[PDB]
Design a protein around this ligand. Structure first.
Ligand SMILES: Nc1cc(-n2ccnc2)c2ccc(Br)c(O)c2n1
Length: 124
């Protein structure tokens, strides 16, 4: 089966709204979300549907833009670096499970370059 998805709320984790975190939701995520290659990354990997039964044997810290989106909307993060780390976990998972040249990797490679472009400059 699929594992439980990552948490999107945690009452005992301190929350914070920063200008940078508002920007990561309004501009960075919500623009990557519209990319033609974004769809595989908008929800946790459904290893059952995709017939990838070894996915969660290999990936032990799953992450996806659907989870990141809910975390941003729920003010789950303390700072932008926490959210950026989640993006990097998602890309890294993709490169770990898959191989250079795979369709999914070409998609992640493209999103990651766009992600890096958008976060090169954050609001102050
Ligand atoms: N082999 C695959 C297939 C994926 N996919 C393809 C279509 N919908 C999901 C996929 C998605 C996100 C991440 Br992150 C991955 O590592 C993935 N790996």
């Amino acid at each position: 089966m699929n594992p439980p998805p990552p948490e999107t709320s945690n009452p005992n984790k301190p929350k914070r709204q920063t200008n940078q975190l508002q920007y990561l939701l309004r501009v960075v995520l919500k623009t990557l979300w519209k990319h033609q290659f974004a769809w595989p990354f908008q929800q946790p990997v459904d290893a059952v549907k995709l017939n990838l039964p070894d996915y969660y044997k290999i990936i032990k810290t799953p992450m996806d833009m659907g989870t990141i989106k809910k975390r941003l909307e729920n003010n789950y993060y303390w700072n932008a670096q926490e959210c950026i780390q989640d993006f990097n976990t998602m890309f890294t998972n993709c490169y770990i499970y898959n191989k250079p040249g795979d369709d999914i990797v070409l998609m992640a490679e493209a999103l990651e370059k766009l992600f890096l472009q958008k976060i090169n400059e954050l609001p102050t």
